[PDB]
Design a protein around this ligand. Structure first.
Ligand SMILES: Nc1ccn([C@@H]2O[C@H](COP(=O)(O)NP(=O)(O)OP(=O)(O)O)[C@@H](O)[C@H]2O)c(=O)n1
Ligand SMILES: [Mg+2]
Ligand SMILES: [Mg+2]
Ligand SMILES: [Zn+2]
Ligand SMILES: [Zn+2]
Ligand SMILES: [Zn+2]
Lengths: 425, 513, 417
RNA sequence: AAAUCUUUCUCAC
RNA sequence: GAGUAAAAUUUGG
RNA sequence: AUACCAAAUUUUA
RNA sequence: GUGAGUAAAUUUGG
């Protein structure tokens, strides 16, 4: 009869309210932690318990061994994109007698950012507390070369350079109104009904990757089939490999709404978007359509409006850069008009004097891009007319940073530098 | 010693201040400051900036996040027993449930729709009306918050009514959405370090940086300003009701109700107050009372000052300053080129709270320090060894341990002084896994949690182990709970299983490849 | 899936059965009728035909899979559906007009909106207030910090001894003598003895603050860790002498004197009088059996004792040392003294910060960090950030603030920035 | 008595 | 006695 | 115009 | 306001 007391006057309550009412209470001790642990020898007995029974059952964790050379750098955000259980996998676990609440807690994809001031040559991600020592999360030569923007040794195939499709490589592409997935052995087709990705065999690995990229729930649908299908020809054809790290989904674009995947490479283990590679990434997908690879701070619609407003006044090169950024930030398949030629021009976005967009923590002034700053010429702002101790002299082609210039004897801050953003080398 | 640091140092090494004082003095001081501001003698609480360019959200469907309305945090519940008013502290869960019981409503969204669709303030919505809800929702209770470094006089905090919280959640959700749509550089969800990095990028085109703070922030945010912003973004009657309750708020101090017509009572509307400034200009990177704008000439500085004045963002002349080589926001200091300023910065010391929790917390603090450039790794190793020695001095008596195994910490009778690098790269005896920052809970944490649990009525039938796809906004009766539990138990028995086996995502994934 | 249709869905499934007893239509909004572990593709599910059903209004499509059957509720009272059976079921079941309420929007204008706006208009409004005139000037100089320290010293002065701070040094007595002196001092003070412990009884309070003066700095604090550990142990062990390797203390519970029926054991809120020993040579000297020592007291509340006892002196010192400029020798009153000053007094200052439960040195440190980072500040206002005497009360916090300001002054004197 | 509205235990009437 | 809001870690469900 | 829950812990306003 | 007693913090930290 506790229901009639907690919810007096009501017969129905939400699951949220009921669960919140079934939360166990914790009473804070008035003693210090030391005295609480001493009381009744609770900690002493617990230590005996742990050493006698719990400790032997503890599995042995592997020891971290892989290191790379690192150098001190700006404070950056290291982004880790941890995926959650898929919908079908959650159903399978729940129907197998596993805890429904724990499974529900593991259903959500998490993205976390950690401050770090240390960078490696290949922009590796580091284990917690070991960035200074260079312990990387990353552990066949083609597998290694597939994740690299610039593979050391081309193998004559798409993974490691320009070329056709190897056996270990699959691809997902969009033809007409269908998504064709080809592995070399099996060819499948998928469609988006309302919020599901309906396909013959959703358990297919390429189908799982497509479901994760489209933010849809896999679904089994026998009555899905296509009319025309060049999967064989494109599989046998050769495509240019853009120099770029793998996107957070673990794939690389090779054509308009087409992406290549490697079976043994799950998810990107290196920073996909960085200050030095952002514009190259934007240029790579200039005309490949939405990618959904780079997260934008704030509203995607507002960012697209700013991109369209800047795009309305710019040269072809700046226009291509802006379109590349729009493709980088737009999720795949969602209700977004990322193409900055059919999108409507917003007057309010023109009203503002400066057009800023923040992509993966990088703040870019689109007005500056229009007048050719991040790629053609750097920006110089004088900070003082006195020499500051501990600052290097101004190089001939300076990158971003604070320098002392003897030619005018002043401290200069360099931003939007091609020596930092273009880096043709 | 903080005075003789070569780099930046906040002085966080010791713990924050403690205080057993009654909250009456601080709450009375806050209310007095708000009243003084109302007279137009000390600071400006009259908003004159233009907010006509904010997008209208009035057409959006009214949706309430139920999870935001239930918690074990404290709240004020108001009872009118015999014409008097009694304010008592309860949990937000209990307060929300009492509110929903008084006005018979399945969910908070049903209550909000009913409140918005009546045709009179006297019309009953159960055992109450909109007039009574507004009367009760303006009552606040006072409390003291201590353990904040740099505040020897702890701060006054206020528990609010469940109905006030219900309306505040809606207006704050929409204020955050408008900030994400309108802010030049969105920061309402970024961390302090992310805000610092974005600010460093933003202010790199101007010579001077104004490291700015606002004083009397919550006392100078008036109900008129709140209503102005809410009308600008289109909150309609919800905004009007919330502004009315804010104007008529009363705080229970000791045993007397004290009127506070001014202010918003210590950060009740952070996003709305931020929008009050962000909606008038795009020249500031700010959230709440912290902005990092920049300028080139004294005329631009005067423009910045006027903009701050017009938005009721009174510049703190005690703490705000101008710099050219550094920039600081949210206590994070960077050089103009984006580097973290050399020094301890915000590094905080670890007090003694247990043999293994102390070591784990020290490891986490040192991992954070070394991941940034705060200190080199060998310094962290030396500090960890010193911490192990101090823990050995503190905890190596029979009242904590009776063991002598070699692999144990010296503070538990062992002879092992582990290296920081060896611990971090899982290169230790498994007993040390609990000390790794990413490792599992330590023995002390389990013991203390067990002690907290064993401190005691009648439990509702548990509604755990639900289908992971069932939305939590669906309704259940007592019979529904019983039937769902019975069906789940029958399905489990069909699988020959006891209580569902605990599901660890990491372990389960490790079985996949 | 929209809650608006929930009730409507329930009417559709009205005691309809199949397979001789089993319910035919299962509502997606019903927690009991839902099939666990099955994704939802419509408002309800027909088990006999294995088909999802959704209810839609005219020109209002809903986001459901195309395989889900749509029951369109036409503007004119009629229910169209591709399946005839569902058409008939809707026709019969929706016999009573079930009008679906419209979506309530956030900008909804209630009937009482104008009334509440008028009420708000009649209530008080703020007045404009004056625009401040801001002058940006260089940060404070050494003379300003010196003026602040001199003001504190003039207004409060100095005690004759270091009082409990002196307990950071050995009193030069053995454990037996220390225990004897502490117990005999407690006896001479007329403390109640009960159950082998000491209790300090009180009846009336003057309800005024104790006298505040600055403490002179002892030469060193070799016993800082021991003293802090003793204070930590005293949190629950009160009324009997506690011994460390080199010193001892006595924590006495302070409880009211009702006279016959009085508190006999401390509770969570009971305060402590901490009695410690230092070398003699002040007005607090106490002698017994030829043993002499200065006895110094400190009145603490439980939170203060817990906070003080938990601090780690050694680790804090090492962390500060990591990136510290050379510390100069200082005198008893925190003045630069090259000829006769001691560098160990800095340890003492650290100990003082550990003893201060208000940690005013943290506010001073934050303001000094701002000072060292600042190029320009507001005239006459930034200087008014070191005037923290009004925020604190008591000898310990006052001395902590004074020596924090002295540290700032010494930094500006010997390592200008 | 002190870092002073704090040092406020229980039971029955 | 400890509110509002943001980031992150572990544990539990 | 529009287009995960709690317990503990650290930091931040 | 009256009377009476003396579960919780001492057990057990050098
Ligand atoms: N624990 C906290 C800290 C801050 N806040 C909010 O942050 C504002 C500025 O906090 P502050 O301490 O800075 N005082 P404020 O009156 O601005 O004056 P000051 O700068 O000290 O001159 C407050 O008003 C609140 O809205 C809060 O709610 N809870
Ligand atoms: Mg600031
Ligand atoms: Mg402030
Ligand atoms: Zn290859
Ligand atoms: Zn195909
Ligand atoms: Zn003395």
């Amino acid at each position: 009869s506790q229901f009639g007391k907690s919810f007096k006057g009501r017969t129905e309550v939400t699951i949220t309210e009921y669960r919140s009412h079934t939360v166990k209470d914790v009473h804070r001790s008035l003693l210090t932690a030391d005295k609480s642990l001493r009381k009744s020898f609770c900690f002493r007995n617990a230590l005996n318990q742990f050493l006698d029974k719990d400790l032997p059952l503890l599995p042995i964790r592997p020891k971290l061994e892989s290191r790379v050379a690192v150098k001190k750098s700006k404070l950056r955000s290291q982004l880790s994109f941890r995926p959650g259980l898929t919908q079908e996998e959650a159903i399978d676990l729940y129907n197998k007698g596993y805890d429904g609440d724990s499974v529900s807690g593991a259903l959500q994809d998490r993205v976390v950012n950690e401050p770090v001031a240390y960078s490696s040559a290949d922009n590796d991600k580091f284990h917690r507390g070991l960035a200074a020592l260079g312990y990387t999360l990353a552990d066949d030569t083609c597998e290694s070369g597939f994740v690299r923007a610039i593979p050391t040794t081309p193998c004559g195939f798409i993974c490691c350079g320009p070329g056709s499709f190897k056996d270990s490589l699959g691809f997902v592409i969009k033809i007409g109104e269908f998504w064709h997935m080809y592995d070399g052995f099996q060819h499948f087709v998928a469609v988006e009904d309302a919020k599901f990705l309906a396909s013959k065999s959703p358990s297919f690995w390429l189908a799982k990757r497509l479901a994760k990229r489209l933010n849809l729930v896999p679904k089994e649908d026998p009555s899905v089939a296509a009319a025309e299908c060049p999967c064989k020809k494109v599989w046998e054809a050769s495509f240019a490999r853009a120099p770029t790290a793998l996107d957070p989904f673990g794939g690389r674009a090779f054509c308009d709404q087409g992406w290549v995947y490697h079976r043994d490479v799950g998810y990107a283990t290196a920073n996909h978007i960085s200050q030095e590679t952002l514009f190259q990434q934007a240029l790579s997908v200039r005309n490949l359509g939405p990618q959904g690879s780079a997260n934008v701070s704030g509203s995607i619609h507002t960012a697209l409006d700013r991109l369209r407003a800047a795009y309305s006044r710019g040269t072809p090169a700046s226009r291509s850069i802006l379109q590349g950024l729009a493709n980088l930030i737009t999720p795949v398949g969602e209700n977004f008009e990322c193409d900055l030629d059919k999108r409507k021009l917003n007057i309010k976005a023109l009203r503002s004097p400066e057009r800023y967009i923040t992509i993966e923590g990088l703040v870019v002034n689109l007005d500056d891009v229009v007048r050719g700053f991040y790629l053609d010429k750097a920006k110089v702002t004088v900070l003082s007319r006195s020499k500051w101790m501990g600052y290097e002299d101004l190089p001939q082609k300076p990158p971003n940073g604070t320098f002392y210039c003897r030619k005018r004897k002043a401290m200069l801050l360099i931003s939007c530098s091609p020596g930092t953003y273009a880096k043709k080398r | 010693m903080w005075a003789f640091q070569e780099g930046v140092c906040k002085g966080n090494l010791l713990s924050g201040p403690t205080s057993m004082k009654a909250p009456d003095s601080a709450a009375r001081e806050s209310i007095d400051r708000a009243s003084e501001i109302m007279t137009g003698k000390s600071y400006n609480a009259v908003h004159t900036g233009d907010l006509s360019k904010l997008p209208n959200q009035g057409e959006s469907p009214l949706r309430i996040v139920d999870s935001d309305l239930y918690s074990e945090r404290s709240c004020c519940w108001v009872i009118e027993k015999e014409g008097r008013v009694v304010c008592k502290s309860t949990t937000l869960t209990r307060g929300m449930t009492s509110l929903l019981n008084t006005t018979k409503c399945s969910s908070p969204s049903e209550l909000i729709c009913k409140v918005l669709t009546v045709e009179s303030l006297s019309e009953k919505i159960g055992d109450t009306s909109v007039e009574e809800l507004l009367s009760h929702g303006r009552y606040f209770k006072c409390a003291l918050r201590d353990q904040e470094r740099g505040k020897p006089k702890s701060r006054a905090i206020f528990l609010s009514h469940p109905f006030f919280r219900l309306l505040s959640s809606v207006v704050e959700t929409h204020a955050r959405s408008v900030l994400s749509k309108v802010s030049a550089v969105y920061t309402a969800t970024a961390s302090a370090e992310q805000r610092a990095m974005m600010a460093a990028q933003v202010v790199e085109s101007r010579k001077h940086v104004l490291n700015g703070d606002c004083t009397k922030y919550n006392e100078a945010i008036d109900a008129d300003t709140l209503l102005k912003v809410w009308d600008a973004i289109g909150m309609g009657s919800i905004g009007v009701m919330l502004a009315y309750m804010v104007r008529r708020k009363c705080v229970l101090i000791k045993d007397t109700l004290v009127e506070c017509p001014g202010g918003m009572l210590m950060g009740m509307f952070n996003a709305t107050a931020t929008l009050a400034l962000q909606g008038t200009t795009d020249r500031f990177l700010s959230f709440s009372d912290d902005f990092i704008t920049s300028f080139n000439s004294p005329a631009e500085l005067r423009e910045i000052e006027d903009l701050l004045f017009a938005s009721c963002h009174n510049l703190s002349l005690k703490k705000s300053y101008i710099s050219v080589a550094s920039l600081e926001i949210n206590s994070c200091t960077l050089t103009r080129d984006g580097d973290l300023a050399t020094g301890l910065g915000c590094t905080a010391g670890v007090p003694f709270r247990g043999p293994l929790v102390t070591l784990k917390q020290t490891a986490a603090m040192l991992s954070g320090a070394v991941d940034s450039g705060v200190m080199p790794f060998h310094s962290a190793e030396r500090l960890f060894q010193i911490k192990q020695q101090e823990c050995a001095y503190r905890y190596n008596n029979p009242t904590y341990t009776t063991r002598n195994e070699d692999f144990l910490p010296t503070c538990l009778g062992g002879k092992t002084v582990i290296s920081f690098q060896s611990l971090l790269t899982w290169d230790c005896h498994p007993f040390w896994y609990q000390v790794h920052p990413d490792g599992p809970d330590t023995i002390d944490q389990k013991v203390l949690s067990v002690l907290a649990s064993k401190t005691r009525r009648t439990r509702l039938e548990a509604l755990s182990d639900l289908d992971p796809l069932v939305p939590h906004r669906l309704l259940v009766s007592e019979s529904d709970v019983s039937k769902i539990r019975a069906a789940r138990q029958a399905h489990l028995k069909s699988l020959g299983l006891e209580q569902p086996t605990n599901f660890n995502y990491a372990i389960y994934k490790a079985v996949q490849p | 899936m929209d809650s608006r249709f929930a009730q409507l869905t329930g009417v559709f499934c009205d005691d309809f059965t199949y397979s001789e007893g089993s319910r035919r239509f299962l509502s997606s909004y019903s927690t009991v009728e839902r099939r666990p572990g099955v994704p939802v593709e419509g408002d309800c599910y027909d088990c006999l035909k294995n088909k999802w059903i959704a209810f839609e209004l005219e020109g209002q499509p809903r986001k459901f899979p195309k395989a889900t059957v749509r029951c369109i509720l036409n503007n004119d009272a009629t229910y169209v559906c591709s399946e005839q059976e569902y058409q008939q079921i809707c026709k019969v079941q929706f016999k009573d007009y079930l009008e679906i309420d419209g979506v309530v929007k956030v900008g909804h204008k209630a009937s009482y909106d104008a009334e509440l706006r008028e009420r708000l208009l009649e209530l008080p409004h703020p007045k404009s207030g004056p625009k401040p005139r801001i002058e940006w000037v260089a940060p404070p100089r050494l003379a300003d910090i010196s003026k602040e320290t001199a003001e504190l010293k003039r207004q409060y002065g100095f005690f004759e001894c270091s009082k409990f701070l002196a307990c950071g040094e050995e009193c030069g007595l053995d454990q037996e003598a220390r225990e004897l002196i502490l117990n005999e001092y407690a006896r001479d003070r007329e403390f109640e003895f009960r159950n082998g412990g000491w209790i300090q009884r009180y009846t009336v309070a003057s309800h005024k603050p104790a006298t505040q003066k600055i403490l002179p700095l002892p030469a060193s604090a070799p016993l800082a860790r021991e003293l802090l550990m003793l204070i930590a142990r005293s949190t629950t062990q009160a009324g009997k002498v506690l011994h460390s390797d080199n010193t001892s203390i006595l924590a006495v519970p302070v409880m009211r004197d009702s006279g016959k029926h009085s508190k006999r054991r401390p509770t969570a809120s009971t305060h402590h009088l901490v009695v410690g020993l230092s070398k003699p040579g002040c007005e607090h000297d106490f002698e017994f059996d030829g043993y002499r020592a200065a006895v110094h007291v400190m009145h603490l509340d439980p939170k203060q004792s817990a906070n003080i006892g938990e601090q780690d002196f050694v680790s804090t010192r090492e962390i500060y040392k990591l990136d510290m400029l050379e510390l100069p020798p200082i005198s008893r009153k925190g003045d630069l003294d090259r000829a006769s000053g001691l560098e160990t007094r800095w340890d003492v200052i650290l100990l003082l910060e550990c003893l201060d439960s208000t940690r005013v040195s943290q506010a001073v440190a934050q303001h000094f960090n701002r000072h060292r980072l600042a190029l320009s500040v507001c005239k006459d206002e930034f200087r008014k950030g070191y005037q923290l005497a009004s925020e604190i009360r008591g000898t310990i916090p006052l001395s902590s603030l004074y020596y924090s300001l002295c540290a700032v002054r010494l930094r500006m004197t010997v390592h200008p920035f």
